[PDB]
């Protein structure tokens, strides 16, 4: 009671701790409004985002019990962190809200893409992006949905990963499926590299300050995607399911792009002999994790040890200690209580 405070947010009521302070909504996602203020206690800015009723259905709770647990046991500079984790509501019966804490970024990458970068910034983000993602493929998490809106920066050029990847809600929200890789608009098996292709469409547009694949459906995404990359070969239709085999190989062919004419000079910084030098190499990553077939596609670790990365390479960063994670399907009722449990820190 008396350790809250309330304040309407739009059209949220936010009851948060008296050390949270000055609270402003800095946006919105999947889960609601999130905002930034000021921790009293640690002296400086936090983020809260709010989670309203997260048990409510089962896309939602599985989502929110995931990011409690993940963000708990992975300690790495490109994932998000808990700072502090609470309910205003006094028992399980009551229990409605979570509140999550965690340290306040600068921007969104959605931001930064809007901006040119030079190559070391570049290149440093998109390293910072591979950690992150090797760190979670250590543990066993595929993301699996990387995106731009779900990337925080600093304006020292650090960054974390937000979430933790991957369905019917009722919900005007439309999740954006741009950067999801073709096994998953496909319906294919997948593994770790699954998140390669995310990385390259996030950087594409980076390069040139567009979407690569903005499609209103998968069925659309597809033929944007083989519009600019091509038709894929005959070995990759094989490792499709008879059904979207028959899918793929009726679609119209294309040819696609070459690399060159997808992502000119002219979207690099290319006036050096130095510059030069890193646009071909850019270009050159960019080739390796926009191909369609997984199994031709780089690795996480091909693309840290790549030339335009690794510059920036560090084994604490790289290499790390992997996270150790201490299928679900329940009722309502069921993961009510397993939120609540985690947010009270009870077995
Ligand atoms: C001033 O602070 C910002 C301002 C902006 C707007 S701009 C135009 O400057 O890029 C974007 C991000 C931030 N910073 C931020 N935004 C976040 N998270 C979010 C921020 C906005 C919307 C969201 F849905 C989230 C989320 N999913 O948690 C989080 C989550 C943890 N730390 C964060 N830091």
């Known amino acids: ?35 930034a203020a000021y921790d009293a206690i640690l002296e400086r800015n936090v ?3 709010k989670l ?18 993940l963000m708990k046991c992975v300690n790495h500079k490109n994932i998000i962190g808990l700072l502090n984790v609470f309910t205003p509501q006094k028992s399980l019966e009551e229990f409605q809200d979570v509140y999550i804490v965690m340290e306040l970024m600068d921007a969104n990458l959605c931001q930064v893409i809007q901006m040119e970068l030079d190559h070391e910034r570049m290149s440093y983000l998109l390293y910072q992006m591979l950690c992150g993602i090797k760190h979670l493929h250590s543990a066993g998490i ?12 600093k304006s020292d050029c650090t960054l974390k990963i937000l979430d933790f990847g991957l369905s019917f809600m009722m919900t005007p929200y439309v999740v954006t499926r741009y950067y999801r890789a073709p096994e998953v608009i496909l319906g294919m098996g997948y593994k770790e590299n699954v998140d390669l292709w995310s990385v390259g469409c996030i950087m594409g547009e980076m390069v040139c300050h567009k979407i690569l694949f903005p499609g209103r459906d998968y069925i659309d995404q597809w033929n944007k995607v083989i519009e600019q990359l091509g038709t894929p070969c005959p070995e990759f239709m094989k490792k499709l399911q008879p059904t979207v085999r ?10 696609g792009y070459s690399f060159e004419k997808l992502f000119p000079d002219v979207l690099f910084p290319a006036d050096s002999e130095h510059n030069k030098l890193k646009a071909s190499q850019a270009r050159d990553l960019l080739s390796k994790m926009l191909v369609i077939d997984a199994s031709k596609r780089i690795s996480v670790d091909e693309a840290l040890q790549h030339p335009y990365i690794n510059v920036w390479y560090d084994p604490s960063e790289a290499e790390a200690p992997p996270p150790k994670i201490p299928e679900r399907e ?10 609540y449990k985690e947010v009270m820190d009870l077995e």
């Open 47 to 49: 983020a809260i985002k």
């Open 246 to 255: 028959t899918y793929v190989e009726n679609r119209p062919k294309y040819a």
């Open 52 to 69: 309203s009723r997260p048990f409510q259905n089962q896309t939602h709770a599985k989502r929110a019990y995931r990011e409690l647990v």
């Open 142 to 153: 595929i993301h699996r949905d990387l995106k731009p809106s779900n990337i925080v920066v």
């Open 330 to 339: 329940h009722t309502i009722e069921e993961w009510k209580e397993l939120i």
């Open 1 to 35: 009671d008396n350790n809250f405070y309330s304040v309407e947010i739009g059209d949220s009521t936010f009851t948060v701790l008296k050390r949270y302070q000055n609270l402003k909504p800095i946006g919105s996602g999947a889960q609601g409004i999130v905002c």
